[PDB]
Amino acid sequence: LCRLCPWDWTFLLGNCYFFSKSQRNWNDAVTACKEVKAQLVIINSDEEQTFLQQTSKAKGPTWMGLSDLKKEATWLWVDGSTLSSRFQKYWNRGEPNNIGEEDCVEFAGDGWNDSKCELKKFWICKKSATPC
Amino acid sequence: LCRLCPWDWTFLLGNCYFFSKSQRNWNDAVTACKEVKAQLVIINSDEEQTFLQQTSKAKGPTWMGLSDLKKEATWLWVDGSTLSSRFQKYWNRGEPNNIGEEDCVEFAGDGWNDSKCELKKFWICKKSATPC
Ligand SMILES: [Ca+2]
Ligand SMILES: [Ca+2]
């Protein structure tokens, strides 16, 4: 009886993902994920980014665990790690913009936008799986 | 008899721009611009970027003075200055990619791609105007 991820979480490449059914502001989304020992999703591979971008298209704009709330124009994941050069290609054309006003990052369409953190959007949690 | 820019060069915001009629590889484009005391275009304002992106759409993919030939994934203008955070929004979705293989930057459509430097593309030169 191999259970890769908890009930209603999805396994992808050694991690477990939870796709919210409701919409919350960015900070509340962060908190929701911490409630289940997880983090508002931190993207770390292209296959992961591809899967979360597709899934998120079916619901609508969706938060990820990325923001420049600490220092404008510097984007940090919720675990404090820096956004790598190779991931900057995921930004949509024209993003990030409205710097200092739109401080949190969302999947929008086929890439990332920065958006106003107070907006309510879907969100995704990620934590490690338990292998079999 | 006020002449803002030399013959067949276009004035925009204190600078003079030359739009090639032929296509050259990136290095040859750099050299062409140096022949006329100019530089393969270094973008320094949004109004400038807007104007060069529109004009370049009418001809086809066009080189700008930007490349990561010195150090992969670090993009420097031809005068050695670094690419600012605010200009990274000009990259098309999915760019820059093919890192280390596509080392020079072009206007493509409505944003920037990195491309193989050996390809022949149009190009644009920029130098200071002489005020009146
Ligand atoms: Ca935005
Ligand atoms: Ca490319």
Side-chain angles (χ1 to χ4, degrees):
Chain A
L1 200 162
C2 176
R3 174 117 227 165
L4 256 14
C5 292
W7 188 84
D8 205 38
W9 286 66
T10 284
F11 180 89
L12 171 66
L13 295 173
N15 294 293
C16 293
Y17 296 87
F18 177 76
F19 295 92
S20 77
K21 281 74 183 151
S22 79
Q23 307 185 80
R24 300 195 216 208
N25 72 30
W26 189 85
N27 277 336
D28 284 354
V30 167
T31 300
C33 290
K34 287 175 179 174
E35 284 259 18
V36 289
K37 191 175 149 43
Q39 290 175 117
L40 190 50
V41 61
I42 293 166
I43 300 294
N44 199 220
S45 75
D46 186 65
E47 191 173 341
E48 168 183 37
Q49 146 67 28
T50 293
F51 174 68
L52 302 175
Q53 197 81 64
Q54 66 95 221
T55 295
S56 70
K57 224 173 163 193
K59 295 207 196 208
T62 296
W63 289 129
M64 75 181 69
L66 182 66
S67 85
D68 76 342
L69 285 173
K70 188 176 180 183
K71 180 172 148 61
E72 281 191 12
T74 300
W75 302 92
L76 300 182
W77 297 104
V78 288
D79 69 355
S81 60
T82 58
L83 178 65
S84 71
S85 284
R86 85 168 311 145
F87 293 163
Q88 303 233 75
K89 66 188 181 202
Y90 297 129
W91 288 113
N92 273 323
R93 198 193 76 246
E95 304 281 330
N97 64 355
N98 294 310
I99 296 287
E101 158 182 48
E102 298 189 326
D103 292 309
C104 300
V105 185
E106 65 172 7
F107 301 95
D110 296 307
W112 308 354
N113 286 4
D114 61 354
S115 312
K116 290 167 116 72
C117 303
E118 331 87 57
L119 299 176
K120 296 193 172 46
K121 299 178 187 288
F122 295 98
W123 75 92
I124 295 171
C125 299
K126 172 190 176 174
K127 58 178 167 184
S128 295
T130 302
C132 294
Chain B
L1 200 162
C2 176
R3 174 117 227 165
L4 256 14
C5 292
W7 188 84
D8 205 38
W9 286 66
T10 284
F11 180 89
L12 171 66
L13 295 173
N15 294 293
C16 293
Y17 296 87
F18 177 76
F19 295 92
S20 77
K21 281 74 183 151
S22 79
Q23 307 185 80
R24 300 195 216 208
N25 72 30
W26 189 85
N27 277 336
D28 284 354
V30 167
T31 300
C33 290
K34 287 175 179 174
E35 284 259 18
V36 289
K37 191 175 149 43
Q39 290 175 117
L40 190 50
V41 61
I42 293 166
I43 300 294
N44 199 220
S45 75
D46 186 65
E47 191 173 341
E48 168 183 37
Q49 146 67 28
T50 293
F51 174 68
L52 302 175
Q53 197 81 64
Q54 66 95 221
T55 295
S56 70
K57 224 173 163 193
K59 295 207 196 208
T62 296
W63 289 129
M64 75 181 69
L66 182 66
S67 85
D68 76 342
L69 285 173
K70 188 176 180 183
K71 180 172 148 61
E72 281 191 12
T74 300
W75 302 92
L76 300 182
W77 297 104
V78 288
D79 69 355
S81 60
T82 58
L83 178 65
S84 71
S85 284
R86 85 168 311 145
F87 293 163
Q88 303 233 75
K89 66 188 181 202
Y90 297 129
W91 288 113
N92 273 323
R93 198 193 76 246
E95 304 281 330
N97 64 355
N98 294 310
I99 296 287
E101 158 182 48
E102 298 189 326
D103 292 309
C104 300
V105 185
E106 65 172 7
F107 301 95
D110 296 307
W112 308 354
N113 286 4
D114 61 354
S115 312
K116 290 167 116 72
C117 303
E118 331 87 57
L119 299 176
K120 296 193 172 46
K121 299 178 187 288
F122 295 98
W123 75 92
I124 295 171
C125 299
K126 172 190 176 174
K127 58 178 167 184
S128 295
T130 302
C132 294

